[PDB]
Amino acid sequence: MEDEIRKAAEILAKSKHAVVFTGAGISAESGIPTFRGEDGLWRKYDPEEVASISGFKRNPRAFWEFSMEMKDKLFAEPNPAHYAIAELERMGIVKAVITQNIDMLHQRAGSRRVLELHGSMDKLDCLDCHETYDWSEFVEDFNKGEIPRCRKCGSYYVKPRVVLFGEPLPQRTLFEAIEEAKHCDAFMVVGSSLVVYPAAELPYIAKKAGAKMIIVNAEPTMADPIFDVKIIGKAGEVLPKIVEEVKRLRSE
Ligand SMILES: NC(=O)c1ccc[n+]([C@@H]2O[C@H](COP(=O)([O-])OP(=O)(O)OC[C@H]3O[C@@H](n4cnc5c(N)ncnc54)[C@H](O)[C@@H]3O)[C@@H](O)[C@H]2O)c1
Numbered sequence: 001m002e003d004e005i006r007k008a009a010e011i012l013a014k015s016k017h018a019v020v021f022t023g024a025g026i027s028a029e030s031g032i033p034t035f036r037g038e039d040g041l042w043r044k045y046d047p048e049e050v051a052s053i054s055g056f057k058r059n060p061r062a063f064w065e066f067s068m069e070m071k072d073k074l075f076a077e078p079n080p081a082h083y084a085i086a087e088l089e090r091m092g093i094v095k096a097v098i099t100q101n102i103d104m105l106h107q108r109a110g111s112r113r114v115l116e117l118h119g120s121m122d123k124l125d126c127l128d129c130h131e132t133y134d135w136s137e138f139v140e141d142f143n144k145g146e147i148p149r150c151r152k153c154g155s156y157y158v159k160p161r162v163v164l165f166g167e168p169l170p171q172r173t174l175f176e177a178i179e180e181a182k183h184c185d186a187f188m189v190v191g192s193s194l195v196v197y198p199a200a201e202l203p204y205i206a207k208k209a210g211a212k213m214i215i216v217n218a219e220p221t222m223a224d225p226i227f228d229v230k231i232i233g234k235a236g237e238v239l240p241k242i243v244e245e246v247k248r249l250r251s252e
């Protein structure tokens with residue numbers, strides 16, 4: 001059973017307002033590659049021109065062609081980990097999910113409260129005429145290698161609602177996440193290296209507030225010491241185990 005998974009369930013089974021923070025690691029088992037080798041990535045492309053709002057206004061194609069070359073799974077679906085977290089919310093334990101991912105796999109899995117720190121691929125906006133579109137109107141053409149283009153004014157500046165270099169983090173969502181970390185009674189990290197703000201700081205904020213800390217990651221992080229329970233392994237495998245044990249403790 002492993003003492004780690006049991007204690008995690010022991011903690012969750014006792015909390016009425018738990019919060020889950022997730023990073024790229026929770027979507028690896030869905031087919032979406034993590035941020036591994038980001039250093040090298042910036043050796044092939046100028047981050048300023050292909051991934052900043054400034055480079056986007058200067059030439060939209062750089063961003064889109066850059067995305068086409070790197071984006072792998074466009075029709076990925078939530079894996080067991082996402083569902084486990086949605087089941088936890090239905091059970092009255094998890095009250096919120098804070099994620100850095102832009103894949104929306106938490107919502108598609110049933111989570112009702114998802115705070116997206118880096119935005120998402122849900123919608124796009126034409127910067128010239130202000131038409132808005134759902135990612136679904138372009139997905140197929142994009143997978144065929146076609147740069148999205150406004151169907152109303154024909155502009156090529158159709159920007160997705162994700163945070164790019166040079167623009168601020170969504171303040172109000174960030175505000176809600178921090179408040180979340182301050183009043184939760186259990187804070188669990190899943191698939192995040194916790195290296196950069198806000199991922200790197202939210203755990204410490206919840207820790208100061210008195211929350212019980214749990215982490216499930218494939219590799220250790222520098223924040224591991226503050227966690228009450230830390231599990232090494234895959235989210236898609238560990239999460240469903242924890243939920244089962246919580247149900248067992250509940251019905252007993
Ligand atoms: N400049 C830097 O030095 C640096 C380093 C790391 C991250 N970052 C930034 O951090 C942000 C993303 O952070 P993040 O934490 O979401 O992504 P991340 O890629 O940094 O971390 C994902 C974590 O998931 C773990 N993981 C992989 N597969 C897993 C699985 N199946 N189950 C559970 N865990 C698994 C990994 O071991 C890793 O620690 C980006 O903005 C990125 O640019 C920057």
Ligand SMILES: NC(=O)c1cccnc1
Binds near residue numbers: 032033034100
């Ligand atoms: N899961 C994700 O949304 C994601 C986004 C960008 C890079 N790696 C993972």
Ligand SMILES: [Zn+2]
Binds near residue numbers: 126128151154155
């Ligand atoms: Zn337009």
Ligand SMILES: [Zn+2]
Binds near residue numbers: 183184
């Ligand atoms: Zn809350």
